[PDB]
């Protein structure tokens, strides 16, 4: 049930960035992956050009890794499913929109529990208090992500016909789920952003190996 216009092919043997996606800031396609960060204090975006018209259920699988640094930082990678009439112009929150309307999934390790993958909601009306990110997650889970030889796959499933289940999974292992989130039908934006910040002069490099978008669950 895979959808091509909203997915990212095998980047191995892709030499030019696929035409249905746009990169930004220091994001380039190196070697079978889109490297979002790689120089000290870098940032990178990678978003779909066309907007997804959400009416029914969906499954969204991201595949990523981090390399080149072990230790605490204010860096992080975040995945977005946010309502907007184009690629979000705001970059103030992990190289992404601080004033979003939908879902942010943040992988970082600067919070009270160390490495996590967390859930974050806003409605577009007022931007989020970044100093409150960790107090304001609707759901989270412990998640070693730093360096781990193999990439992790985050699987986001939204099951409209089951009292709207938002279930996130890391490597087929349940990270969290809820029914407190019901996306109103609209045109949504899909992308990932990152930054490694400045702490301890780190060069944490975030890589995107693939992303798959299915209609339905």
- How many whole angstroms separate alpha carbon 217 and alpha carbon 215? 7
To which residue do tokens 């969906």 refer? 58
- How many whole angstroms separate alpha carbon 53 and alpha carbon 44? 25
Q: How are beta strands 52-54 and 28-29 bridged, if at all?
A: unpaired
Reduce the secondary structure of 33-77 to three states and give it as a string. CEECCCCCCCEEEEEECCCEEECCCEEEEEEEEEECCCCCCCCEE
- How many whole angstroms separate alpha carbon 46 and alpha carbon 159? 26
Domains of the chain are: 1-217 (2.60.120.200)
- How many whole angstroms separate alpha carbon 94 and alpha carbon 49? 20
- How many whole angstroms separate alpha carbon 25 and alpha carbon 45? 7
Contact 35, 205 (CB under 8 A): yes
Alpha carbon distances (Å) from 100 to 83, 97, 103, 113: 7, 5, 8, 25
Shortest CA distance to 66 belongs to which of 10, 143, 8, 148?
148
- How many whole angstroms separate alpha carbon 76 and alpha carbon 66? 10
CA terminus-to-terminus distance, the chain = 9
- How many whole angstroms separate alpha carbon 210 and alpha carbon 190? 13
To which residue do tokens 């204010």 refer? 74
**E strands present in the chain:** 21-25, 28-29, 34-35, 43-48, 52-54, 58-67, 76-83, 101-108, 116-123, 140-142, 152-159, 165-170, 173-178, 186-195, 205-215
Count of positions (residues) in the chain: 217
């Amino acid at each position: 049930k895979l959808s091509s216009d909203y997915s990212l092919p095998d980047l191995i043997n892709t030499r030019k960035v696929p035409n249905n996606w746009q990169t930004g800031e220091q994001a380039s396609l190196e070697e079978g992956r889109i490297v979002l960060t790689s120089n000290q204090n870098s940032k990178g975006s990678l978003w779909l050009k066309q907007g997804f018209d959400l009416k029914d259920s969906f499954t969204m699988e991201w595949t990523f890794r981090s390399v080149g640094y072990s230790g605490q930082t204010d860096g992080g990678i975040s995945f977005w499913f946010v309502q907007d009439s184009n690629i979000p112009r705001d970059k103030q929150l992990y190289n992404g929109p601080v004033n979003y309307d939908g879902l942010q999934l943040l992988v970082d390790n600067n919070g009270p529990l160390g490495p996590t993958l967390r859930g974050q909601l806003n409605d577009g009306q007022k931007p989020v208090d970044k100093t409150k990110i960790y107090d304001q997650s609707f759901a989270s889970c412990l998640m070693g992500y730093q360096d781990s030889s193999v990439p992790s796959t985050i699987r986001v499933t939204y099951d409209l016909e089951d009292d709207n289940l938002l279930k996130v999974q890391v490597d087929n292992k349940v990270c969290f789920q809820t029914r407190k989130v019901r996306f109103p039908s609209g045109s949504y934006r899909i992308g990932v952003t990152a930054q490694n910040g400045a702490v301890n002069n780190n060069a944490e490099s975030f890589e995107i190996f693939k992303m798959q978008f299915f209609n339905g669950v």
